[PDB]
């Protein structure tokens, strides 16, 4: 199976598999059953921003999701990712729908990774504030598409604009990322994305995640719905 | 009194005032008596590197000090600096000597502060990899000088190069820094400096600190030696 | 007198002192009579963006001003700024009104200077604060609670006032060149909103680089854009 | 054929194909016969640094190569690279030897591309890894355990070999221009160590920008620097 570290924006409470009974942000270490969650008020049709932060000194993976009116949710988890991730990874965004559905629109995405030693460094930084129709530095998987409106649609949307159910899609940056290296004194990464989740359903579902995977990661078969395109099962 | 948050590279164990019985790196929140320390092997005459990291999501102030042979010490402390620091600060480097002495030479210093909200930001970044004789964007205090060798000598050195006792000096960046702001979702800062501590004494003393202070901070009277130019007393 | 290098966004043609007969962007080296200009269609009430670029290798000072519909004006001038500026400088934004007027609202400003062989300064304001401790405000310039920097005076009911001048300078001096550096470069970007109900908007906005102790020259409202004591 | 824009650090004068009669730095636009050159004193066994700078406003491609004693050579060429390069590219380093030889050791490489109206790519290698998954190595190029990138072949006892050619390309394609961008800029820096015990060092190192599927052209050792199929 793939190795997955992720931050989930989980719009649907699947209490059968350990979700809390409300929409939530979560930290996922090799399981869709978050090691840590926090209550999250997803604002239907509003543009939200997620920030994800980690470094090898503090060994704490932190995330905050916020909307323009000021409401925010935060979750942190203490973990040494050196003991979890392979040395080389790809980084990506994933989203899904199931019996319920929502747009999983990404308006922007930035990422920075640094390996530091004895000086004021190896580094990778990319930022997309507009996506292109043929975005050659992104690997799209599943239902994910980039449009001429400058956005990344992780899950399927109809020609009339409406989201579709039982959809799953992901976008990974093209280059592998050197996420740790034994001679480095500091390894850090940061990610930010902005998103627009909109639904006319009885309940929106399923959510968006930022994830870090093995370089050859692919969408697990059957990972629509509650598995967020990240995991083959709810274990 | 000034308000001080600092990371100390403490070369002399002052066990009377709560130092551990070995050289150490420490996190100082409004007291020279560190809230958290870790054992540190200072390598006499070698160039070391210190990295300091904080963000308002994880609320953990982390530091690591390392030398070219690979040895490193790390300390982290959980603290919400919003409840400690004023909104506007200056950032700086400080060092002292006492009855024992050492060179407190800074070879480079970088700093980044960011205030983020709902997007992929206000920011300040500076880096000095060489200091100038007349370094107009630095406020020097006490015995601190910049040379034509490209370094910052925080404490006094004789014409023959040898360090002097009972010395104290500091360098602050000229512009005030907006270290937190209530509408920001993320406030983060990072600092890195490289240093060369060298001594022929029976024991080196006293150490170097990176600090964040009120904008009008000055060297407390009598803060040579164990007080590291940061504090008026050992309380 | 001060030493001034500036990029001007000149909304009012003063053909009396060398302006072309249209609004224009210009490169100003120690005089308000631009060394190089390009025609500029200022879009009243729209948010524009100015990008300014220089490096000591190419020794070209370049600027472009653009609006969201894509219309843009560009101007470039070959100059070795080592021969013009003091080693240490301050960097700033300036604007003026005169007999005609406009808002000179800055929504964001960023700046980067590097000396490589690296020393570097970078700041970004995407929202300004009411009491902006790392800005030196001169003349009529204020920062509000709307996150913007108003370079010239605006009345309580929101409207711009005439014969106004104001500037904002970054607090720290900047080391703009150093003889041992292989590359000295700088870049600046700002976004602005110029709005006018006048018969003609005037006078404009500039990004400028000055001696560290620069102050608004006496009488520099109107066509002198808060930068120069005279039209020489 | 490939489409190539390059900055060459040319250690061997091939006056037969248009080189000046001295080692030189040159700007190459779709041909090995540089559009612009400048005399260059390569310092055998010393670590040098190359800085390359371009932006779509000034439309000047500039480069400087320098050593720690301060000696430097600079070359600039006015060109609109929108008219030359494909929208998407890969960026890389290339080097060759021929009948004379040298080490073509890269100690560090950084690159930044930005499209503003911002999209951006930045990478920095200050130490290379043995299995460098974000580099595409072509020809004789290898990465070691000493943290360096060896573009041409070196023998087990450390010495450079003749008629060798190798390149390293960053794994991700780069969006080097986009029609809606107001500013498209890129910058690259690399540090290198060219060492030779030969009667003359040869042939040199280049930073280059190519079509995304670029490969070493057949026969491009020696004076063609791994970039071009011929001297046209
Ligand atoms: O922050 C800055 O000053 C530079 O970023 C920008 C520049 C131009 C435009 Cl249109 C939008 C942005 Cl965010
Ligand atoms: O990392 C890079 O590629 C750029 O940084 C440098 C550039 C030139 C020199 Cl001499 C030294 C350094 Cl650290
Ligand atoms: Ca769920
Ligand atoms: Ca002590
Ligand atoms: Ca005018
Ligand atoms: Ca040649
Ligand atoms: Cl369920
Ligand atoms: Cl299952
Ligand atoms: Cl004691
Ligand atoms: Cl005391
Ligand atoms: Cl006139
Ligand atoms: Cl006059
Ligand atoms: Cl020849
Ligand atoms: Cl040929
Ligand atoms: Mn969940
Ligand atoms: Mn101590
Ligand atoms: Mn004019
Ligand atoms: Mn040549």
């Amino acid at each position: 199976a793939d190795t997955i570290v992720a931050v989930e924006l989980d719009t649907y409470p699947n209490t059968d598999i350990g979700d809390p009974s409300y929409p939530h942000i979560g930290i996922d270490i090799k399981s869709v059953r978050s090691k840590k969650t926090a209550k999250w008020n997803m604002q239907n049709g509003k543009v939200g921003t997620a920030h994800i932060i980690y470094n090898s000194v503090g060994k704490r993976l932190s995330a905050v999701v916020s909307y323009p009116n000021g409401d925010s949710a935060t979750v942190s988890y203490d973990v040494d990712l050196d003991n979890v991730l392979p040395e080389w990874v790809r980084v990506g965004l994933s989203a899904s729908t199931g019996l319920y559905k929502e747009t999983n629109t990404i308006l922007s995405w930035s990422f920075t990774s640094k390996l530091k030693s004895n000086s004021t460094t190896n580094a990778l930084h990319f930022v997309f504030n507009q996506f292109s129709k043929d975005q050659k530095d992104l690997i799209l998987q599943g239902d994910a598409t980039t449009g001429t409106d400058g956005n990344l649609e992780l899950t399927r949307v109809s020609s009339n604009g409406s989201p579709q159910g039982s959809s799953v899609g992901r976008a990974l940056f093209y280059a592998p990322v050197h996420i740790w290296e034994s001679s480095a004194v500091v390894a850090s990464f940061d990610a930010t994305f902005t998103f627009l989740i909109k639904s006319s359903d009885s309940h929106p579902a399923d959510g968006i995640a930022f994830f870090i995977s093995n370089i050859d990661s692919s969408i697990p078969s059957g990972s629509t719905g509650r598995l967020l395109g990240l995991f083959p099962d709810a274990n």
Side-chain angles (χ1 to χ4, degrees), chain A:
Chain A
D2 292 339
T3 299
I4 301 293
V5 171
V7 171
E8 58 166 64
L9 279 66
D10 190 338
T11 52
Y12 190 85
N14 301 98
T15 54
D16 284 10
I17 61 158
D19 279 339
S21 68
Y22 38 73
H24 53 281
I25 58 166
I27 290 162
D28 295 357
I29 309 303
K30 302 190 298 193
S31 168
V32 69
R33 306 187 181 232
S34 305
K35 308 308 185 182
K36 196 91 167 277
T37 65
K39 197 181 173 293
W40 177 45
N41 302 308
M42 183 292 277
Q43 295 185 35
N44 192 356
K46 301 309 199 213
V47 176
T49 306
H51 299 278
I52 299 92
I53 303 166
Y54 178 78
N55 72 72
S56 64
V57 184
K59 294 174 202 300
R60 62 179 291 166
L61 175 58
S62 291
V64 61
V65 177
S66 57
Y67 281 103
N69 76 341
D71 194 40
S72 62
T74 187
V75 64
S76 296
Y77 183 64
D78 286 351
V79 57
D80 188 354
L81 294 175
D82 279 6
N83 298 334
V84 175
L85 289 167
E87 187 173 356
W88 287 90
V89 298
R90 281 194 162 89
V91 301
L93 299 172
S94 185
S96 63
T97 62
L99 291 177
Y100 297 122
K101 71 193 64 73
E102 71 198 21
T103 64
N104 289 123
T105 310
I106 302 300
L107 287 70
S108 69
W109 180 27
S110 63
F111 174 84
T112 300
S113 168
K114 303 178 171 205
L115 303 171
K116 301 187 178 179
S117 192
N118 286 284
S119 161
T120 296
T121 291
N122 289 10
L124 171 72
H125 172 61
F126 62 81
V127 54
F128 303 110
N129 277 304
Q130 300 296 346
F131 297 92
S132 291
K133 183 70 181 153
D134 171 37
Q135 179 91 70
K136 288 191 198 303
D137 56 358
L138 286 182
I139 300 161
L140 300 177
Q141 304 178 324
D143 295 332
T145 58
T146 54
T148 42
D149 67 355
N151 298 334
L152 160 66
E153 292 289 7
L154 290 165
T155 51
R156 198 154 158 204
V157 298
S158 295
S159 51
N160 73 354
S162 80
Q164 297 191 2
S166 68
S167 178
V168 62
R170 315 195 309 182
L172 298 83
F173 185 71
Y174 193 103
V177 181
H178 203 176
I179 208 69
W180 62 255
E181 206 280 347
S182 296
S183 70
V185 63
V186 176
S188 64
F189 66 82
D190 295 281
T192 297
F193 62 94
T194 63
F195 60 86
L196 182 60
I197 292 165
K198 204 184 168 178
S199 180
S200 57
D201 280 23
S202 293
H203 201 298
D206 273 310
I208 301 179
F210 166 77
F211 73 98
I212 308 182
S213 66
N214 45 302
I215 62 177
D216 60 328
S217 180
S218 58
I219 294 167
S221 199
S223 61
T224 61
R226 68 200 190 180
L227 299 179
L228 300 168
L230 292 179
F231 298 107
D233 56 56
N235 290 344

